[PDB]
């Protein structure tokens, strides 16, 4: 079990850790989150009580260092930092626990939700999408734009997702124009899986990370990226059987976890209706289809 301590909570803010969240009052004595399960990535995110715009937060993995949170009154936001002094960091964590000023990561033992949402997400890949190599954790917020969005302005603050574009030379072999546009198998399997992602686990990891950023920060370009990578599989006639089955589990837990009241912006009607009912893979997403119908029959 690991701990992310907080120096203080000067401003009233809603704090999330993974899918859990707590309200903290201006200068309430809040001093960290303990019992954080080792072995998965995690995200700690913020929304100030005074600006319900700009949700923001930090992806991290506690195996990679000792990390803590501190409010910066100049830049006006809670900042993640690394403590390199191991002894000085256990000292702070132990004193805060003794005083019991830390919330416990509230995992129910029956629950694999977080594992299922993050199964393929690896901190090393996150830090290639969010390039900022002097920190071991990654900052993301509501307003960050993607590389593909920029092309159609500040690159230091860009989400470097893999660019997918169904009407590009990358996607379409000369002479197979109609074949490749109607059946994206060559783009999925040769260009993206074998070529760029190397394997399906890295592909699924970016997909899951894109979804989580859309859900937790309302990041619009992440939502676009998640839908694109879904559509690319569903629009391919030839997909490894192991990918289809894992995909149905991945999407199931994503749909299960979404806030009911956000289904309007986060879910793209055309993509899902095409994936579930028109695509090559209509018959291959039985659990995802069943949850979608029983929870959002309107969108369909």
């Amino acid at each position: 079990m690991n701990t992310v301590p907080f120096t203080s909570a000067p401003i009233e803010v809603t704090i999330g850790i993974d899918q859990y969240s707590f309200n903290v009052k201006e200068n309430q004595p809040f001093h960290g989150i303990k019992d954080i399960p080792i072995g998965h990535v995690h995200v700690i995110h913020f929304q100030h009580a005074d600006n319900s715009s700009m949700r923001y937060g930090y992806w991290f993995d506690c195996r990679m260092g000792n990390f803590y949170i501190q409010y910066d009154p100049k830049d006006g936001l809670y900042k993640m930092m690394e403590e390199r002094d191991g002894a000085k960091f256990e000292n702070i964590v132990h004193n805060f626990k003794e005083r019991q000023m830390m919330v416990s990561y509230p995992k129910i033992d029956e629950d694999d939700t977080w594992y299922n949402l993050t199964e393929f997400v690896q901190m090393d890949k996150i830090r290639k999408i969010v390039r900022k190599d002097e920190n071991q954790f990654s900052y993301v917020d509501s307003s960050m734009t993607t590389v593909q969005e920029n092309e159609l302005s500040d690159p230091a603050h860009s989400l470097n997702y893999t660019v997918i574009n169904f009407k590009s030379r990358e996607a379409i072999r000369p002479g197979h124009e109609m074949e490749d546009f109607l059946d994206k198998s060559y783009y999925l399997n040769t260009v993206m899986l074998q070529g760029i992602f190397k394997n399906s686990s890295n592909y699924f990891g970016e997909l899951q990370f894109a979804f989580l950023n859309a859900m937790f920060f309302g990041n619009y370009g992440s939502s676009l990226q998640w839908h694109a990578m879904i559509e690319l599989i569903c629009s391919s006639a030839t997909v490894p059987k192991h990918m289809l089955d894992k995909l149905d589990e991945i999407l199931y837990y994503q749909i299960k976890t979404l806030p009911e009241q956000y289904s309007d912006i986060l879910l793209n009607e055309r993509v899902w209706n095409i994936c579930l009912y028109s695509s090559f893979q209509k018959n291959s997403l039985h659990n995802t289809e069943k949850i979608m119908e029983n929870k959002y029959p309107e969108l369909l």
Binding site: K167, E177, F181
Partner: protein, 237 residues
């Protein structure tokens, strides 16, 4: 963006542009089989690619052999159209390649876009106009060359004959669309109007009769009257 009544004069500026109409690309007859089922038989078709400023028409004849052994032929027809249009652009010198291609049916955007990926500066546009280019096979010389073809063939025509020696592009296109609109609404009457006077002939190198300026006025009025009559009949107005 889309072409409409507002931006209609753009068709006659000096930016090269082509209209593409795919309506006559895949043509069938429907008939009963011996066992009483329905079957189709394909006949020859054409792509109608037209420069509205100059009148130049690139009639690409689509021979029934294209379809042999293929499924989902109405979808394939769109990709074959786009394939052939792209090949036409590639065949033209750089300074003759269009800056825009306007498709008369929206289902053509994605096939042409994909076939034109090598030409990112050629803009593919839909249109909101209801252009009558499907009646191209009502023009006797075009129908004749399509139906006689024994292999894929491109035939070039000027669809304005020599009108541009005496009128502007704008007026020429308006005459062409009025003539085709009438042929579309009532082919038999439209054709009667054009040929009634046997002393007005069609030159061997032309598609339409050699009307004088005043005779064109009488013709155009007769085609307007045809079109309005058929409307009242269609709707009981």
């Amino acid at each position: 963006g889309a072409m409409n009544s507002s931006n209609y004069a753009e068709l006659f500026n000096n930016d090269i542009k082509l209209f593409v109409d795919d309506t006559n690309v895949y043509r069938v007859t429907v008939h009963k089989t011996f066992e009483g089922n329905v079957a189709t038989k394909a006949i020859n078709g054409c792509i109608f690619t037209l420069n509205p400023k100059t009148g130049h028409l690139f009639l690409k004849i689509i021979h029934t052999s294209v379809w042999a052994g293929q499924k989902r032929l109405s979808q394939l027809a769109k990709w074959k159209t786009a394939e052939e249009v792209s090949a036409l652009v590639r065949s033209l010198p750089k300074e003759e390649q269009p800056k825009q291609i306007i498709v008369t049916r929206k289902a053509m955007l994605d096939p042409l876009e994909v076939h034109m990926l090598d030409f990112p500066n050629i803009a593919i546009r839909p249109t909101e106009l209801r252009l009558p280019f499907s009646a191209a096979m009502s023009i006797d010389k075009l129908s004749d060359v399509v139906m006689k073809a024994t292999e894929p063939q491109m035939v070039l025509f000027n669809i304005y004959d020599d009108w541009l020696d005496r009128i502007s592009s704008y007026t020429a296109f308006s005459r062409l669309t009025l003539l085709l609109r009438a042929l579309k609404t009532n082919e038999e009457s439209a054709k009667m109007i054009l040929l009634s006077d046997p002393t007005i002939t069609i030159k061997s190198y032309h598609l339409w009769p050699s009307f004088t300026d005043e005779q064109w006025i009488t013709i155009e009025s007769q085609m307007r009257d045809l079109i309005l009559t058929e409307y009242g009949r269609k709707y009981n107005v």
